[PDB]
Amino acid sequence: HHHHHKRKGIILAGGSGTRLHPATLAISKQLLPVYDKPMIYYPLSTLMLAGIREILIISTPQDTPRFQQLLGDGSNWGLDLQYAVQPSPDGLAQAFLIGESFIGNDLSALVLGDNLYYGHDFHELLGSASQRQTGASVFAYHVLDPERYGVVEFDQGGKAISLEEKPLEPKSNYAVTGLYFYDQQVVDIARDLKPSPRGELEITDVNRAYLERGQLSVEIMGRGYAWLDTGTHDSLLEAGQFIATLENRQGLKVACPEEIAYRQKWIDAAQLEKLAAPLAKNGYGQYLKRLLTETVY
Amino acid sequence: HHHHHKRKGIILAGGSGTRLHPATLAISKQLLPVYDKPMIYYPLSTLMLAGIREILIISTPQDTPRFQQLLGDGSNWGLDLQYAVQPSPDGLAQAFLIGESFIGNDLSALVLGDNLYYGHDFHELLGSASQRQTGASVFAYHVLDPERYGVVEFDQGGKAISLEEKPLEPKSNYAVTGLYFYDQQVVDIARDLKPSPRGELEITDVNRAYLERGQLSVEIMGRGYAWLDTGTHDSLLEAGQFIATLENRQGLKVACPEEIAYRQKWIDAAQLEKLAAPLAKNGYGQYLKRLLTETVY
Amino acid sequence: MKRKGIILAGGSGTRLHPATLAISKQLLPVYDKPMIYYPLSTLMLAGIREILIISTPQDTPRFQQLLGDGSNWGLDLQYAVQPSPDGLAQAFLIGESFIGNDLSALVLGDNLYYGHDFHELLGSASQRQTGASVFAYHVLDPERYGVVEFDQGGKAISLEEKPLEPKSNYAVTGLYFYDQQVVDIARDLKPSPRGELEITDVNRAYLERGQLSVEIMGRGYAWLDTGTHDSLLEAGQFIATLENRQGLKVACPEEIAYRQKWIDAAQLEKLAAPLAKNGYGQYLKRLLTETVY
């Protein structure tokens, strides 16, 4: 007998094959900085914004130690970070089999370690997904090139009616973004997946399984949000310029984990002050210091 | 006797002195494009988002005809556009004396013709300002360099308690943005202003007058909004790159007046189709065409 | 012998509308200065002081207002209009009386160049008293341009304007040096199938006689693209990154006039006054007392 009487995060950061070689020969894409910080800070900060404190980072065997050196066990930021390896890039849905013991009987959320988001009320957008305990929640976002993505088709009433992975003739311009919230059904659904035509375990098949059960919520992520492309060297550069323009204008940083932990009340002023000390001689540490004596609405 | 029984817009687009010379020797700043469209499209689109259909464009004598050629009388976009000249750059609050006959007994809103905004729920942010019929509404936005702006000081409860124009030691990092909503008190307040130390009629003195009457609402424009700097050649370039990254990612345009009029139901599908015809051979006209047969949430 | 310059700054049509609905592309700035400063600076660097600016009927007065007669910068500027965009070769019909019996050079008003020894690359073109000189430059999209084909020995053997199947990746740049033959060649041109008097036909005229020098503008040079919104932006970011790293401006005509000895220390000082309170005037004042090699 079980007794009745929260949600766990996973970041998939398993590199990018040979696609961005030779730039990425020496290091994983998700460790490349976007402007002033490692790329993985952005998706990590996204889970943190969602209220998620227990997080599994999945990376290659080769680069797990570098992620561990960067991020540690999470204790500096009021988190618990665990690590797992992905020996072979067999697809996104593999995160649930690799993370099966990590997930246990809890709800979960998956984010791609190369996905950057920005916008107003993002916290509330994520909170509504997080609070849907049952079913799956995903986000749809209008893009120029939906053929590159999982694409969501809507009826005249706005109801999601189909999902297609990289269709040659997209039914809409609405791509499914790399942020996914799941209930306790996901690991079993994932265990029963067959590899696609490309020998790959597809997240879109998972989401379609939920859709078929009538348990997929598709929330629109509106045009006033920025979901930044990191798929090409060109988009990477644009991502960096975007973040720089925002931060240099505002004097506020996007996806600074120290700050988000501090505003979530996972760390206090004294602990924030300690995290500042080692980087006091650069703008990043000076930024952390300033946050101790400024009200930011 | 009067009988009881809406809001009018003004765009101040009077160039920028010799500050950006020689770039601006041949044309007004507010006619320079930001990426794919004239700069003035952005603030105009902002008033339109606010529901404002009756709009006065104030510019130099020299460049009024170029604005008129670009924008016409507004009828193509379901607007009414009127024009006035500013012979001498005597300051922002002068818009109310120049626009006194235009404003009549109505509520009003002023936007700077070089101010660009972007973000999620911007429509709702503007709608709440617009619906406050009484008093004045402005927006405060965290910036790196508040000393360049009107700066708003808040007490521990978040109440605005003072305003200072370009203080050497800012009380906060919260700048007052170039978007202002006013009731019928503004023209009289403006008529009674004395020129500042720089022989200039200050908008901050207007706003302070409302603050002193207890009739200033300061709404925070949060960090997830982008209020883009156009004060320098460097910021202008960043503004252009920002818009380009957003539009090329999304396949949706920022501050396309044809689109906003169409979504506000100020023009119909047949009229939108006609506006598309003359630019059918470029991406702008092709964009307008696509909007006729796509649902965009 | 004298060589006169022509800048063609005509219309880009509706192709960049609405950004260019109010004013022509070449009057807009690239970063910190009007686009036209860059081609003008190019001719000045080539040692050319007598220059005809050709633009649309609507915008010629505004070019006249921006640049004047040139005497502030040691130049002798004149102006003319191209009523319709009927081809680049039309520059020599419009500018026939301006050219007279002199050598000539044509630059396109939206073309930006940069690199080391640009002065000497131009000087060597300017020095050829006979024939015509053009520059070929490797580009990813040669189909947009006049395309030069070379034999195995490096010799130019053909030119095709916007070929559907380009013979090489070498584009002819928007800078052309001609001898006294070009007017008579241009006045015999017939309109092409797309309806224009083609500069590539003028160039093929010289090529058929062995009198077209096609010099390679190497990859260490920047010929920046201004044909799209995207490329206009890249040009702004390119000039800004160079200028902010070096503290030296690209295509500042006051500076170029001063280094050519066309204006003196005193005259550059007067030019610095009006913009003393901004970066451009500050730059020009610094030129008075800094040795730049």
Place this chain on the structure above:
Amino acid sequence: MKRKGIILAGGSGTRLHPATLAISKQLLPVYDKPMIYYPLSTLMLAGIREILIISTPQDTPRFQQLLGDGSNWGLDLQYAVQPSPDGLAQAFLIGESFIGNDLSALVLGDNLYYGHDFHELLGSASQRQTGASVFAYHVLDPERYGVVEFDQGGKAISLEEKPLEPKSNYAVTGLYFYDQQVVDIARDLKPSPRGELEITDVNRAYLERGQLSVEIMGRGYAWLDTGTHDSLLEAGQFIATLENRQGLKVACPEEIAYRQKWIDAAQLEKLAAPLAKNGYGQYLKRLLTETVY
């Protein structure tokens, strides 16, 4: 006589942290390729095939993994470590046995160069069998660098490292050519007040004997800044704008090896295979059948 190359790719400290917390700056890409490809390409362009790469203890194995022994690219690469950032002059102590009795050249691992005839600017430096050659370049912020002062006749008369009051806007670039004297000069260096064995002291050693050639790297050259987050970004956008306009890559070592005749058509074909499905491999295959001037 043989000239050997050294690339110093040491630590930037905590100054770019956290972006560089996980891995050193010079292993990160600039646009499409690892930063270190650019300085390596610079030495290769200078005709140097025997090259010692010096990095931090933690990252040397990763440079070893990226570049191998060099034989795929017609190079002979070796590796060594700088345990602590105790000065650029330390390169010659670490690399003493590597250098032996040969001429040498040092490039900083985070320095990017671009422009026309860069090959000939380097070649002329390489050809000087005696003394030392450096390059001076006008910058807005000379206080960050080794600063060269010139008399009215153009002669270098002093060097100051990071002066509070710089004597000119001319910075010494991160590229240095030395004769057989440099090791013996470096082994006599004492640490400066900031605690480093200074390359500027090595250069002043040559200057005191009339044996420092200070050549001007002109404004038509790009020496890009990689010292800040802002400048790293500008470098990426600068390389991208050049490469996308031209269809030609800056500092592709496979290409440079191929043009130097250090690898043949067959060997470049093998190098193209692994990345055939992306832009880099496609670029390299195209080099086999395209004449680029």
